[PDB]
Amino acid sequence: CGLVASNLNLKPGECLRVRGEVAPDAKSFVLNLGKDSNNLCLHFNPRFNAHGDANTIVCNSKDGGAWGTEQREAVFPFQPGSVAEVCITFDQANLTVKLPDGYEFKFPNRLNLEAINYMAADGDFKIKCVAFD
């Protein structure tokens, strides 16, 4: 239900910066990146309280509609009702995801994407700024 952007043409090296507002009573939010809605190199899902999980970032890929192997990340630098920025870069092998509080992690480029052209936000997160570096 959130912002949906296409024709991003993000290439290796370039940096995608997304800043937004986390809802005051947020349960969770999603930032999906990829080729289109059926081919996601990154489903980024911070969960405050959803599906039985509290404060955990869940990530996965989707290839031709098929979800890959899900994984929970090590940190959760997000708070309800607050501003947050996430930054993404990628190359042939990995996406690098930079988070608030100086944390970051890499996620395998399972789909072997050469560009990222699609981004969609869902849940309790409203995008207010997008920048291409």
Added chain:
Amino acid sequence: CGLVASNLNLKPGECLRVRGEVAPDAKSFVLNLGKDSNNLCLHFNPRFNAHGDANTIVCNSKDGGAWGTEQREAVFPFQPGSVAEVCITFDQANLTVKLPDGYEFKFPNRLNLEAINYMAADGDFKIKCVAFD
């Protein structure tokens, strides 16, 4: 076609800022804003050298697929191979479009939009950042 964004949810009084690179040898570019691709409160079209026009900004609306009456502006603060930012806000009566070099113009809110949810860029203009505040 350049960046396309939907579900922007720009509300009255909020400011939409779009900054991009005007390509060298640019002939023209377009920034479309509205409810969706068929309902545009603003088709903003700076023409450097296109369709018989030189250094002229042409604007229009589109309602249910039908183009309105084109509007010519009186200034052209753009140049090929450079960065340019436009800022847009609206109320019930008019959109206000702020351009480089301190120029601005108003364009009637023909569709009586109460929010802007769609933005698309075309032509020789590559969006570097978009913000809502």
